[PDB]
Amino acid sequence: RARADKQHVLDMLFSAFEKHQYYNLKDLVDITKQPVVYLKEILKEIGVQNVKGIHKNTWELKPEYRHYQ
């Protein structure tokens, strides 16, 4: 089903995370005009969230169990 985008979308995340350890939702959509709700679900399973000074929305691929490399 939409898992094709999932595997292909992770490649885009690694490229984006390759330039910086943190990325907000707005930055991720510019890299992929795919529905955020779809991106958030992928980030929800392996991603993480962090609020900072001005509640900066950031996300990080949780590497705790990425057997895939």
Swiss-Prot record:
It is found in: Nucleus. DNA binds at G53, H55. It comes from the Eukaryota. TFIIF is a general transcription initiation factor that binds to RNA polymerase II and helps to recruit it to the initiation complex in collaboration with TFIIB. Belongs to the TFIIF beta subunit family. Heterodimer of an alpha and a beta subunit. Interacts with HTATSF1 and GPBP1. Interacts with URI1. Interacts with GTF2B (via N-terminus); this interaction is inhibited in presence of GTF2F1. This is General transcription factor IIF subunit 2. It comes from Homo sapiens (Human). The gene is GTF2F2. The chain holds residues 175 to 243 of 249 of the full protein.
